[model samples]
Target: NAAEVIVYEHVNFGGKSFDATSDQPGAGDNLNDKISSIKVKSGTWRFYEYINYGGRYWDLGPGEYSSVESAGIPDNSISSFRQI
Candidate 1:
């Protein structure tokens, strides 16, 4: 299977969430700029600050990110993402 990830709208995997198996040009208006935590199930993924994989970004390996802020990522700032 390919890489997969779950992005949450709040810390500790709370609130709304989205699943990704490939790149997303934009997480969409509902989910964009609302990511606060994530769970990487396979491979590595990058979260971008802007749409279409642009602007500042962060690479996350397979693991649980309880809080994006604790990981040094600005909360509610991810607009796009991709598996790397």
Candidate 2:
């Protein structure tokens, strides 16, 4: 069987008309694939992805984070994947 892959899009307040670029969520939405629930095999696996600024965490509004364009996964390789 072929491994399935999902692609997601994101957006930030940077360069937009909105003054507050914080308060916006990115990438985590848009569930294009029907992978809400799944059961994986008892094994190990590795995946690669390129994420833009503020992809992992939410921006402003209560705990307002510093507004800076940062590349989350700024590399081709992602480490720290473990199997138990």
Per-residue lDDT of model 1, residues 1-84, tens digit only = 599989999999999988888788897557899999999999888989999999999999889999999888999999998877
Candidate 1 versus the native: TM-score? Answer: 0.93
lDDT of 2 by residue, 1-84 (tens): 222222222223222122211211222323211112112233322222212321232111122112222323322122112122
Worst 10 residues of 2 by lDDT: 31-40
Stretches of candidate 1 above 4 Å error? none
RMSD of each: 1.2, 15.2
What is the lDDT for 59 in model 1?
A: 96
Instruction: Tell me the spans in candidate 2 whose CA falls farther than 4 Å from its real position.
Output: 1-32, 47-84
Assess candidate 1 and give its lDDT. Answer: 0.89
